[PDB]
């Protein structure tokens, strides 16, 4: 009985890790994208830009 409990939680941990890693990946890329959008915003602050640029 005890062994059965342990095995079931092995499986649960397997699937939890699946989802966790899959999130982390796109989350890192989201950080990247936020940062690039930030940089191009800071360039919008450039006080020499013409309207077409």
């Amino acid at each position: 009985q005890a062994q059965a409990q342990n095995s079931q939680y092995a499986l649960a941990r397997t699937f939890a890790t699946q989802k966790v890693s899959l999130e982390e990946s796109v989350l890192s890329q989201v950080t990247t994208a936020i940062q690039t959008a930030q940089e191009k915003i800071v360039y919008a602050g450039n006080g020499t830009l013409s309207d077409d640029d």
């Binding site: 800071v42 602050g45 450039n46 006080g47 020499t48 830009l49 013409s50 077409d52 640029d53």
Partner: protein
Amino acid sequence: ANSTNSQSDLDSIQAEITQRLNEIDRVSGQTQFNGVKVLAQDNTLTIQVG
């Protein structure tokens, strides 16, 4: 201001002055940067340095 100048000479001086002023207005209007004019008005500009 020389009282010795004859009026034709004064007219010549006025010609030269007029041409200088023409160049001044040219400089004012026509200078540009990146395509935008700089001095054709009183202007106010903030650069983001932080």
